[PDB]
């Protein structure tokens, strides 16, 4: 059905990850995008080109939204058309540092809804996958979110984000303070949105939240969380929106809503807007 | 090497301990509280510690111990000159309870209050980190070397938020984080265990670790792994590392270490050599 696309997606993700996991051992030319901490390498760009070219060959009618393609001037507008939403390296800062959480993420949407997701954590060798109505898996093991409904026994994942604007940083850290002092059991950060979300899918964390991500950060992993039994929503507590720059990916609505209650929202430019 | 036999035995016991932990992590757990609702312990932490201490006491009856859960049970935390095994049976208990996949057994061995060898077994990953003073650091037999990065603005740091939930204290922790973050650095990561964070520094995958509120057992095994990989340990004041001070910067080099020390406001803590 789309099982053909998905099987293909899994092989491409694995191929891309081999490229990434080969490059990581090599000397790298770190380049900057929007800020001195917003990094990109030729590997990011090479992998995205490879993915888009391979998909274009097999599925010439399909649409793409790719992080580096957007950096090169393409639009981040999601139509109804089958659309591949790619983050060629989610965890570029980790990649640069050889910090061992580096993922290739592919989300596939039709009618603006994700139908399947693939996240390959290539240093770990963990292939996370999910298709709508068919469950979530890591290396074939079927995933289930945790059962925890008590925020004070929760373990959260988040990331401090790409902005270094003091007011923004202070707001991110204030939001972390409020959650931390609920209290919760802990907060962790492995340095990649897609892997943090996959950790929620496995049950090893109870929820992830972040503001400032993009559709390509969340498009592969969000369906892995929901097929593992979890939920997605905006940090505003509103419906999840791939283009809103904000997410809570949680084991369940109770924790998700409890988190949303503490998040001061930071104003963000949508991926679907100028 | 007089201490080499001790170290080889330590590796043995750490792997045994890791097998215990990595079995138990899959199963139902009884999660208990120590000093607060977020300071956790399980029967596995206690069982592993008892196993290690009883095993060491059998081979080295004259040796001393400082073990996290033994201290919880009332033993003294102060390091004497006598050969001392400093044990964290599970560093990453909160991770263990949640099945967050970083959980370590840590054993440091001190003589004359100086660490002579350290063993950290990261059992979910199957990674055995070891170092003997003057003999280098290894992971699964591969020699480790810290990163070469001397520019703080290109550095990746690891830290943890700690066990306190007192707003004042949390604010100082986060303020320290804000200052470093805004230097800026490339990022900060937290995998949930001081020993594993420090072993990430030893491998070069992070450039430096800092934290206040750890204990000697959190850092006794991994500190020499860092230094034998070429790195440095420093107090957050910029002064010499003090194993009983509850504070550490463990970095690839003195340039980054000192640059981090410059931004840290010290939080007040009971030392491990105080009551
Ligand atoms: Se991948 C993953 C993520 C969470 C828990 C377990 C796994 C995993 O690899 N499981 C597994 C896959 C294949 C064979 C044995 C075990
Ligand atoms: O596992 C590692 N190497 C390794 C590779 C092959 C055989 C034995 C060991 C390693 C690499 C980098 C950091 C830490 C480790 Se444990
Ligand atoms: Mn990326
Ligand atoms: Mn403890
Ligand atoms: Mn412990
Ligand atoms: Na990027
Ligand atoms: Na990303
Ligand atoms: Na680095
Ligand atoms: Na990141
Ligand atoms: Na509140
Ligand atoms: Na510990
Ligand atoms: Na949990
Ligand atoms: Na430089």
Numbering used by the authors:
A (entry chain AAA): 4 to 277
B (entry chain BBB): 3 to 277
Reproduce text from the manuscript describing this model.
IMPase is a key enzyme in the intracellular phosphatidyl­inositol (PI) signalling pathway, whereby IMPase dephos­phorylates inositol 1-, 3- or 4-phosphate, collectively known as InsP1, to produce myo-inositol, also known as free inositol. Cleavage of InsP1 into myo-inositol by IMPase is required for the recycling of inositol for subsequent use in the PI signalling pathway. One enzyme inhibited by lithium is inositol monophos­phatase, which has led to rational drug design targeting IMPase as a strategy for developing novel therapies for bipolar disorder. One such IMPase inhibitor is ebselen [2-phenyl-1,2-benz­isoselenazol-3(2H)-one], an organoselenium compound which functions as a glutathione peroxidase mimic.
In this structure, ebselen is in an open-ring conformation, with the Se atom forming a selenosulfide bond to the sulfur group of Cys141, which is consistent with the known binding mechanism of ebselen. IMPase contains seven cysteine residues, amino acids 8, 24, 125, 141, 184, 201 and 218; of these residues, only Cys218 is near the active site. The binding of ebselen to the Cys141 residue in each monomer does not lead to noticeable changes in conformation in the active site that would prevent the catalytic activity of IMPase. In the crystal structure presented in this publication, the active site in the tetramer is still accessible, suggesting that ebselen may function as an allosteric inhibitor or may block the binding of partner proteins. Previous research suggested that Cys218 is the primary reactive cysteine residue, which is supported by the reduced inhibition of C218A mutant IMPase by ebselen. However, whilst this structure clearly shows ebselen bound to Cys141 in each monomer of IMPase, our structure does not rule out the possibility that Cys218 could be modified in vivo. There is evidence that modulation of IMPase away from the active site and dimer interface can affect activity; synthetic peptides that disrupt IMPase–calbindin interactions prevent calbindin-mediated activation of IMPase and mediate antidepressant-like effects in mice. It is possible that ebselen interferes with accessory protein binding, possibly by formation of the tetramer seen in the crystal, to moderate the activity of IMPase in vivo.
